[PDB]
Structures are given as structure tokens and as C-alpha cells.
Amino acid sequence: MQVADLKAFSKHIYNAYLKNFNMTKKKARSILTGPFVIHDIETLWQAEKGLPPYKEISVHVFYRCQCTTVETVRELTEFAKSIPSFSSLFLNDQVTLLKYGVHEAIFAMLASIVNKDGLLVANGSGFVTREFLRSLRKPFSDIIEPKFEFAVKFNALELDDSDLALFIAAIILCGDRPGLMNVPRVEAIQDTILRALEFHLQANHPDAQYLFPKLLQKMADLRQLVTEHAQMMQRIKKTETETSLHPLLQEIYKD
């Protein structure tokens, strides 16, 4: 695959990204820099004016992280389907890739609707302050704060949508997911994306130093972020018998 092929590869992947996600970084930045601030119980309740029956604040906020996560999984599945060589993989490989890398994607993208004071919710019509989310009882708060920690260090790399389209595709087409059927083919496609990614960054961030290796580490940082997250998800599955989990996320944390 030539430099030109990879250039055209990026217009394709970017197009899939624009067609498919409702919230780009362009739409978010412009909103953030100038929605309803949800900073406490009065504000949440107001902002509420089909989730499980409301039990308690920390828990209902938990359920809204579920309603948002679910929505994004569907977005990425579509996004994955529009990646050039993905529709043409074993379906078992298509599911395994989604099942193991969607959460890395979600948290890489969450950085985009995040800043240091909180995040945009509800298609950018709401804003939940970092503080208020810090204030829900453990173990919910302790599942939310590390993702913020990550995001703030990641928006420092100052990436745009056309860069995130490739970063994200690189994460889904990861050929180390366990139980893959055709590992070398995935590894092919992945490598073609990290190559297209390498050239894109030369064009679009030419003074930027060391960007590519910086990005590969954050890929690794994400694996453990998800590892540390999945752990906590399991701790909720056990310590919080009353609290439920959408069956779409039941089959994700299945194995």
C-alpha cells in the first residue's frame, strides 16, 4: 500500500466517522467554548424534566452512563462496518473485535466531550460537572474519576476528528483480542491503519513532535484503563445486587 493509497484510506475512515457518530470533537469544542449545568440533585432532577426505576442518585447516574455507553456501542458498530476491510471479516471476528475494543474506543472518545470541569451529556444539551460526579458514593465515583484523569492528559495531544477517526479505527482493528479466527488479516488491516495514521500526523501536525509514539502509548494506557474499569464493573456486579446492567453490556463483560 502506497502513500497515496493511505491518503485516500484516511478520507474513507474519516467519512465513516462523520457519517456515524453524532458527536464529533468539532461539535463538542464549539459547544464547550460557547447548555444546562447539572451540578447537584436540584439541577439533575430539573434536567430530568426509559431507565430502571429510580433507586438512588449514585445508581441512577450509573444507569445513565449505561444509556450513553449503549448508544455509543451501536455507533461504533456502524463505524466499524464502514471501515474498508471490516465487513469482509469473519462475523465471529467482527463481534470479537467489537466486544473487546469498543470500551477502549468509548473512553478515547469521551475525552472529546470532556474538559476539566465536567462533561457534555444529552447531545450537548446538558453538562455534568466533574465535581458532582466525584460526589456520588463509592464505588460509582471511583469508576468515573480515572476516565477524566485520562481524558485531560489526552486532549493535551490536541487531536482533531480526522486524527481520531484513525486512532479509533486502530483500536477496533486490534489483532491481539483473544479468540480471533484470522489474526494475521486483522493484523494486516491494523497495520495499514497505523501506517495511514503515521502519515496523517505528518501532514496535519507537522511541528508536533513525537506524536505517533505518544499515541501508541495512549493505546496501551487505554488497555489498562479498560482492565481497571472492567475490574470495577465486576465489583459492582457483586457488591450492588440491587443495581442492573443492560443485556448488551451483560454479553460484553460475559468473558
Task: Give contact residues for a copy of itself (rule: CB under 8 A).
Answer: 1-2, 4-5, 8-9, 84-85, 87-88, 90-92, 175, 179-185, 188-189, 192
Which three cell numbers mark 255? 468473558
Q: Which residue is nearest to ligand 1KF, using beta carbons?
A: 64
Q: Please answer whether residues 25 and 161 qualify as being in contact, where contact means their C-beta atoms are separated by less than 8 angstroms.
A: yes
Give me the least distance between CB of 200 and a copy of itself, in Å please: 16
User: 88 touches which of ligand 1KF, a copy of itself, none (CB within 5 to 8 A by kind)?
Assistant: a copy of itself
Nearer to a copy of itself, 9 or 140 (CB): 9
Question: Where on the phi/psi map is residue 7: left (φ > 0), alpha (ψ -120 to 50), or beta?
Answer: alpha
Give me the least distance between CB of 236 and a copy of itself, in Å please: 28
Give me the least distance between CB of 206 and a copy of itself, in Å please: 25
Q: Please answer whether residues 129 and 118 qualify as being in contact, where contact means their C-beta atoms are separated by less than 8 angstroms.
A: yes
Can you give the length of the chain in residues? 255
Q: Please answer whether residues 110 and 147 qualify as being in contact, where contact means their C-beta atoms are separated by less than 8 angstroms.
A: yes
User: 128 touches which of ligand 1KF, a copy of itself, none (CB within 5 to 8 A by kind)?
Assistant: ligand 1KF
Which three cell numbers mark 76? 461504533
37 DSSP β-pair partners: 127
User: 230 touches which of a copy of itself, ligand 1KF, none (CB within 5 to 8 A by kind)?
Assistant: none
